[PDB]
Design a protein around this ligand. Structure first.
Ligand SMILES: *[C@@H]1O[C@H](CO)[C@@H](O[C@@H]2O[C@H](CO)[C@@H](O)[C@H](O)[C@H]2NC(C)=O)[C@H](O)[C@H]1NC(C)=O
Ligand SMILES: *[C@@H]1O[C@H](CO)[C@@H](O)[C@H](O)[C@H]1NC(C)=O
Lengths: 49, 40
């Protein structure tokens, strides 16, 4: 009926606590948030389901 | 020998009844013990 709600921080998974690699990721920008919306969208529908 | 435990992080989720109704809010720090809050 459901599967485990996983939440991922893409800004952290790509690199943990490096401000540097984070400052570079801002040049791609939107892709991090686009996945956060998606993983929220999977996670919320486990309650619905 | 030392065990390294990378520092406590987690989701910040904010709770709001009616922002329209009120400007008060409450917070959830997802997956972190309370010890790590008055400490932090
Ligand atoms: C939050 O962490 C504290 C430790 O900082 C936990 O308290 C420990 O609980 C065990 C089991 O009763 C005791 O043996 C220890 O003496 C406690 N430590 C201290 C410093 O009091 C507490 O259980 C944790 N809470 C949650 C919800 O995980
Ligand atoms: C919420 O907005 C409506 C207008 O659409 C207003 O009538 C209502 O009083 C507002 N709620 C609160 C708690 O003020």
């Amino acid at each position: 009926v459901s599967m485990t709600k996983t939440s991922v921080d893409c800004t952290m998974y790509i690199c943990g606590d490096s401000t540097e690699c984070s400052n570079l990721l801002l040049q791609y920008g939107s892709f991090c948030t686009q996945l956060n919306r998606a993983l929220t969208g999977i996670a919320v529908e486990q309650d619905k389901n | 020998i030392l065990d390294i435990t990378p520092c406590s992080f987690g989701g910040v989720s904010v709770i709001t009844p009616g922002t329209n109704t009120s400007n008060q809010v409450a917070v959830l720090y997802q997956g972190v013990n309370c010890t790590e809050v008055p400490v932090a």
